[PDB]
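Notebook B, p. 112. Complex prediction, attempt 2.
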Amino acid sequence: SDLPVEEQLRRLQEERTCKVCMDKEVSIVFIPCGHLVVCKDCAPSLRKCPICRSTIKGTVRTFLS
Amino acid sequence: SDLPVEEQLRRLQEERTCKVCMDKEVSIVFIPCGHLVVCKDCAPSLRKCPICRSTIKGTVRTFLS
Ligand code: NA
Ligand code: NA
Ligand SMILES: [Zn+2]
Ligand SMILES: [Zn+2]
Ligand SMILES: [Zn+2]
Ligand SMILES: [Zn+2]
């Protein structure tokens, strides 16, 4: 793709944005699933990953650069 | 911003793309710095993080979703 720019931009914004608050950017990696889908403010409120449903056993704070 | 879409798209592509191979997408988080800047193919060739310069002491495989 090969797809409209604003459509490509929307897809990247979406994958970089928190899946629970739809506001702040992702910054927490779940262990063991490895999803990067929530921000640091939202992570403590979760027992399980929003995407798959693995019970979060650890977390790593990450920075996109 | 408030900036041209193709410019916004370029910035997001760049932050999602490996900083060493400029090809595959980022998928490794460095420990302790927490940078997500390289792919899984490129990570083993590094002793230090490309962005800051922390000596990588561990890694977590992450998936953007
Ligand atoms: Na998990
Ligand atoms: Na590091
Ligand atoms: Zn959030
Ligand atoms: Zn998950
Ligand atoms: Zn790479
Ligand atoms: Zn670093």
